[PDB]
Every structure is written in structure tokens, then in C-alpha cells.
Amino acid sequence: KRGIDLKVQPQEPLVLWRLLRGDTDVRVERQVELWGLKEGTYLFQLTVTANVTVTVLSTKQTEDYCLASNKVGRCRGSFPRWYYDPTEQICKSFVYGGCLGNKNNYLREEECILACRGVD
Ligand SMILES: [K+]
């Protein structure tokens, strides 16, 4: 499986395994619960193999991942995607053109929720 990179708001238990690289000492407890994550990046190997990285967003990056307008972009494709609407504080679906969009653009609603739940 190709790696995943999850952007998330800091949250002491992150609800979704072995840590390969983290700025801090995470603890993973089995859904799973990630404890101790701080602003920054973490890399895990998942086996029953795959890469999972978790980027705990800064407020500055949160502007890009949550506060930016949805962006169809220049291409004429049709990709169902998700963006966060901070005005209404909810994840909405939109059709993405497939290129040159911005960071407020998630493949899965759950990923949008993780990236932006609680942002205004
Ligand atoms: K989805």
C-alpha cells in the first residue's frame, strides 16, 4: 500500500502499529489511540505493511488546510473531494478538477474532519 499522510489538529488522544520517527514519544494504544503527539511530524509502520505519517498542524498551516477557499483548479476532471468550511465549521463535499488546487482538499471526509474539526 502507498503511504498515507494525515494532517490533524493537535488532540491528545487521536482516534483512527509502530513508531519509526517522531519528534516526541508517542504512545499507540488499541480503532487506535495516539497519545503524546505534538505540533510536528510522525512516521509509523503499520503491519497486520504500509507507511502512515501524521502531521500535527500548526495554526499557520491550519490557515492553509482549513481556512482557505475550496479550489476546483485549472483542470476539467471530476474528483469528489472534501474541504472545510470554517464559517459553518463543517466538512463539505466539492468536485475538484484534479490539479493545482490548494491544501483544503481531502480525499475522505474523515481526513478533513481530523484536519479541521474545531477550527473557526
Ligand atoms: K469519504
How many angstroms is it from 111 CA to the middle of ligand 1? 8
With CA atoms as reference, report the closest residue to 99 among 74, 64, 81.
74
Instruction: Identify whether the C-beta of residue 21 lies closer than 8 Å to the C-beta of residue 42.
Output: yes
Q: Cβ neighbours of residue 103 under 8 Å, at least 6 residues apart?
A: 7, 61, 64, 65, 68
Place of cell 484534479: 98
Instruction: For residue 108, give the DSSP letter.
Output: S
Which of 29, 58, 57 is closest to 114 using CA atoms? 57
Distance from residue 110's CA to the centre of ligand 1 (Å): 6
Q: Are 21 and 43 in contact (CB under 8 A)?
A: yes
Look at phi and psi of residue 73 and say left if phi exceeds 0, alpha if psi is from -120 to 50, else beta. left
**Cα 25 to ligand 1 centroid, rounded to whole Å:** 30
Report the alpha-carbon distance of residue 51 to residue 30 in Å, rounded: 18
Kindly give the pairing relationship between strand 79-85 and strand 50-56: unpaired
Cα of 106 to ligand 1 centre, how many Å? Answer: 9
Which cell is 48 given?
A: 497486520
